[PDB]
Amino acid sequence: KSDHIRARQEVLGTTIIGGTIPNPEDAPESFRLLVRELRSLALELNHFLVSEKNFQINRKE
Amino acid sequence: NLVFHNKAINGTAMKRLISRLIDHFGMAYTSHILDQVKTLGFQQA
Amino acid sequence: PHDTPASQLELADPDFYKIGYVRSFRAYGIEFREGPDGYGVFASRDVEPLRRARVIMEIPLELMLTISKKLPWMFFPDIIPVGHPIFDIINSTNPETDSDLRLACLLLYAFDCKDNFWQLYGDFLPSDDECTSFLLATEEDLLELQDEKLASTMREQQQRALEFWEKNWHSAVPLKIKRLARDPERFIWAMCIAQSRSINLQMRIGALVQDANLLVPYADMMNHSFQPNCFFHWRFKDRMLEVMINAGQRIRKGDEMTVDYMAGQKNNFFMQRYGFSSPVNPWDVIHFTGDAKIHLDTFLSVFNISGLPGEYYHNSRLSNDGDSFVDGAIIAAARTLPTWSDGDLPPIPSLERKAVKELQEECHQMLAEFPTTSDEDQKILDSMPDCRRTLEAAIKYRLHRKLLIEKVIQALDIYQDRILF
Amino acid sequence: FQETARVLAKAALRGRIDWLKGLKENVVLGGVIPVGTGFKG
Amino acid sequence: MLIGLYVLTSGNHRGICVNRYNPCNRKEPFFSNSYDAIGAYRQKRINLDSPLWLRWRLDQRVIASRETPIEVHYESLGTFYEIYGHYLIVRSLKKQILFIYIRTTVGHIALYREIEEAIQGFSRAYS
Amino acid sequence: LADDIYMGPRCIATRNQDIGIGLVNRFITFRAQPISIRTPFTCRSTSWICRLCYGRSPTHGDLVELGEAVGIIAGQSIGEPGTQ
Amino acid sequence: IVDYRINEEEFHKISLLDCDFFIRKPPDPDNDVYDFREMYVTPPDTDIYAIPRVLAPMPQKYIRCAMSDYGCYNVTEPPIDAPRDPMYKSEREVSKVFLTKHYRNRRAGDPEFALDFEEIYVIDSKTKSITRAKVVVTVPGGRNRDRKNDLLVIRDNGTSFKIIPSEERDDPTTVIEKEEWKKSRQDMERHLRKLRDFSVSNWF
Amino acid sequence: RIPFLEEQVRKIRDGGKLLTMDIHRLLLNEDNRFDFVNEIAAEAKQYVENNRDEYGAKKAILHVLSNRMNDAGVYRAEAYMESDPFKPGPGYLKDEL
């Protein structure tokens, strides 16, 4: 409903067609902005997910 | 299976009854009882 | 009219249900009927195969009588007052073996306590004449069984009950205690009712999960089967026991609703607790000390028994041609007969023939040792229709044991013919 | 929730890692909070 | 809503307020079912506060004080009438309660009826 | 309850049993003085609680379910009466 | 304490709130005959027997009697702890028992049945005592007055007994109304006494 | 049988109070409410994925719930949907004050 650009544009379509709406995985813009602002004061924030099954670490953008 | 009351009802007494009815009959029955008592109260007033 | 199992029987008084209905007992899709055997529960509607379970009866906690299995003794409907003399009698019982005695005492108290469902319901329970429990059996009946070991156990049990009555119902007892069991036959009726009608389940009342032994009204009218239509479930929130139809089973009108009392047990146990015996007890044992062994896998194949050893069932789709010979007893047979199964090497046909005869020999010996033949037994049973109920039971135990030995002979032979196509 | 600059600095220096185990944190990330329907069981 | 409930259950004048002179020198309606009573109120036969007597077939649920009977009147053939303030219990030699009558007002019966009917209605709907 | 309460050789209540108004009253009649209760201060962690320590829910009258936010409810409960 | 335990199958048992009273029973077809010669009283539902306080002369011969109970119903609202727990609880609470002599020891079936209200005996729960009542016959007709037109009125917590003629009885509303008027009058005066002008006022 | 309860029964069914009663029955079989909400949501998704065009005035969540009740023996209409027997004509709207 607020601030996820890709996701927002899809829901209007699912509804007109009659489909189901998936749960979003990417971050909202609000979060992306914070990272950019911090990277402006020379600090870095990263989000990683560690897979339970194989132990791999993946960096979400 | 309910008591017959021959004395007045004031606000304290209604809270005690709604509480007692929730425990014996459950929230669903109590909701219907509540809507019906409302109608009676508005009409008499 | 349509032929249904229920048709033969007659409807019970309206009052069986009413006494319960005023308290919150509800029955759905069910009736209740009476017959010579006693009350039984039947169906009144058709249910198609179903996705999840359906409730047939809901019985509230207050109607029931219950005691916990472990040592701090907690009685959930809580009829007994604090300081009453009955607790001392209940407390002085071995925690592990006697629960029957504790339950008996509680039932007797209930009959003396006002406004307790049991005062009303007990009128519907079996009388001394109509109960099959063997605690209430004479020397003669015990003799007719023809088994030394079952007979002995029963006598030890009869004595245990008398001893309790003497020890606790002595002369100096306060009258409250005395009134409950003035004569010793009353204690015995009570132990008989406890043993025959008790159910063990795990119950959660509030936040306490405990395991208990309980006497529950209206659910005792179900009968045993080893291929059961229904089961028992505790619904915690409304504090009720639910009897429920198993998922996926078609039930047609007029059918009998059944539950399974104990699982995995032989006919000797059913007689000690319930005075009932079954021609087909899938788990019964006939003992052969004879050396010979037939090969296992083939046995299963000829008679189409499929499954793991623990669970054997007849696949009926494989048996396109309508067969009937295979029943509980052939399954029982599989487990009992000594068998050899090695690797994958196929059995030699002549080699096995030796085994079949040697095994059958043992069966002939067994049948002979008994005083009478199977046909003779039916005659005694048919001769007197009205007789002490315990006596008909004893004769029927005999007929049943013999009949299973006979079935095995018939079956081992069929193996022979089919080994060689 | 109060001293934003001060906390952030101390942390950047120490390379702090936060396992996101609370409610407010997961809200910022726009992900399902681990309570109720979200708690998985 | 509370005002209305209070008014229904408030009651009636009891002694000096209802009679000018002592009743010594010298209420009436008796109804068999509650429905009739509610009906009379509509037809203006009685008022909300007028006292009435209602037959009760059930089991003494009336909340009242622990008060012994004001007068027991006992007759020779064997029937005894017991007058308590809010109720009359008629009993016989075999010690059986032939009748119970409750002294009340229309307002009290109206609240009971609504609570009872709602319970029964919800039950009949489920089915 | 965290321990059994006994009057003579009989048990009024057993461990792991919830207390309601009827039980409390029995304890008052029979004068059972020391009662031990599991409480939020008795739990073994500070990042979470267990159902038994918290106890019955104010909303639904049964033991709290796994997954409930006890903390947000506490803050709100102390605070809302504050306007008065 | 008697020191012997009686057979209670031979005794009438009358139960009152705080006591159980036992009186001997001579055998009879309708169970109406009483002997006041042997009596015992026991704490409720417990079996240590004891001798009653007898406060009056007691009959020395068999008497046919009828029994009635006096008391108050108690309705309580009990605490609710389970889903279908009871909302109300009602108890009879008997406090006194009145035993009245059948006339001429006659039997119910006879066309001539009446009760002799002159002889009434009371059993009291609080004091564990048995006594005889004092009746005031205000009914003209003398000792020979017909017993088919007699009514007994009991008032005052069982402490007043009177026999009056039947037609002169008061309807149920009048008894209630009379009582309310007395109480209400006394209460208004109590309120109005405090005012400084009471001495110079008139009830109207 | 109480004599005059007819209107109240018509209304309870018509109003949608039936649904409320049903939700309660069904939650009397469950320890965690949160899980039951998740189970029902999943069933509804399967139903809409398999036959998309049935739904729109018939709601999937309602269908899952009616199906549960009918399996257990209480007759409920499909998706708790009831017609207005007395509507004047096409393009007419009831004023449910």
Nearest to C131 by CA among C279, C278, C274, C277: C274
Straight-line distance from the first to the last Cα atom of chain G, in angstroms, rounded to the nearest whole number: 63
Return the DSSP state at G10.
Answer: G
Give pairs for C91-94: CB < 8 Å, separation 24+: C91/F9
Q: Across the interface, do H73 and C237 touch by the CB < 8 Å criterion?
A: no
- Phi, psi for residue G116 in degrees, rounded to 5: -100, 110
d(CA C202, CA G186): 65
F11 is in an annotated binding site: no
Query: Pairing state of beta strands E52-55 and E97-104?
Result: antiparallel
Residue reference for tokens 């036969």 = E45
Q: Which of G45, G47, G82 lies nearest to residue C239, judging by beta carbons? A: G82
- Chain A environment of H48 (Cβ under 8 Å): 18-20
Q: CA-to-CA distance for C113 and C107, rounded, in angstroms?
A: 10
Interchain contact, E112 vs B4, CB within 8 Å: yes
- Residues of chain H contacting E, Cβ within 8 Å: 2-3, 5, 8-9, 12-13, 17-18, 21, 74
Single-letter code of the amino acid located at C125: L
H/E element, C413 = helix C389-419
* Chain A residue closest in CA terms to H45: A20
G-chain CB neighbours of C25 within 8 Å are none
What residues of chain D lie within 8 A of the CB of H34, using their CB? Answer: 36-37, 39, 41
Q: Which chain G residues have a beta carbon less than 8 Å from that of B2?
A: 87-88
Decide: helix, strand or coil at residue B34.
Answer: helix
Closest CA to B18 of B8, B7, B29: B29
DSSP-derived secondary structure for C338-381: -EE--TTPPPPHHHHHHHHHHHHHHHHHHHHHSSS-HHHHHHHH
Q: Residue A33 and residue A39: Cα distance in Å, rounded?
A: 10
Inter-chain CB proximity C238 and G83 less than 8 Å = yes
Interchain proximity B28–H12, CB inside 8 Å: no
Residues in contact with B8: Cβ distance below 8 Å, sequence separation at least 6, in sequence order: E6, E9, E10, E11
DSSP readout, G60-91?
A: SS-EEEEEEEEE--EEE-----STT--S-EEE
Residues C65 and C214: their CA atoms lie apart, in Å, by 6
3-state SS class at E35 = helix
8 Å CB contact between A13 and D39: no
- Contacting residues for C215 by C-beta, under 8 A, at least 6 apart: C64, C65, C66, C103, C107, C193, C194, C197, C198, C199
CA distance F38 to C366: 65
Question: Closest Cα of chain G to B36: distance in Å?
Answer: 20
User: Can you tell me whether residue B20 is helix, strand or coil?
Assistant: helix
The three-state secondary structure class of G116 is strand
User: What whole-number distance in Å separates Cα of residue E123 and Cα of residue B29?
Assistant: 9
Judge contact between C302 and C420, C-beta under 8 A: no
Q: Which amino acid is at G92?
A: R
Q: What is the dihedral of CA F54, F36, C204, F60, to 10 degrees?
A: -30
Token reading at C312: 């054997």
Distance, in Å, from the CA atom of G138 to the CA atom of G38, rounded to the nearest integer, reads: 34
What CA dihedral angle connects E51, E55, E59 and E62, to 10 degrees?
Answer: 0
- Amino acid symbol at C241: L
- Chain B residue set in contact with G, beta carbons under 8 Å: 1-3, 20, 23-24, 26
Give resolution in angstroms: 2.7
A vs F contact (3+ beta-carbon pairs below 8 A): no
Residue with tokens 């048990």: F11
Residues in chain E, total: 127
Q: Using CA atoms, how far apart are residues E29 and E17, in angstroms rounded to an integer? A: 20
Q: How far apart are CA G130 and CA G122, in angstroms?
A: 6
Spatial separation of the C-alpha atoms in residues F71 and G9, rounded to whole Å:
67
C-beta of residue G154 within 8 angstroms of C-beta of residue E72? yes
Contact yes or no for G147/G71 (Cβ under 8 A): no
Distances (CA, A) of F59 to C131, F16, F63, F64, H77: 50, 21, 10, 9, 32
Amino acid type, A35: V
Helices of type H across chain E: 2-9, 34-42, 106-126
H2 and E122 within 8 Å at the Cβ level: the answer is no
Please state, in angstroms and rounded to a whole number, the distance separating the CA atoms of residues E1 and A33. Answer: 54
Query: What radius of gyration do chain D's Cα atoms show?
Result: 13
Closest Cα to residue G116, out of G195, G63, G192, G186? G63
Q: Do F47 and D41 touch (CB under 8 A)?
A: no
Distance from CA of B22 to the nearest CA of G (A): 9
Residue of F nearest to C89 (CA): F9
Subunits with at least 3 CB pairs below 8 A relative to chain G? B, C, E, F
D7–chain F Cβ distance below 8 A for any pair? no
Cβ contacts of G77 on chain E, cutoff 8 Å? 63
Tokens coding E66: 């622990």
Alpha helices in chain D (DSSP H): 4-14, 23-28
* Selection from G55, G66, G68, G62 nearest residue G36 by Cα: G62
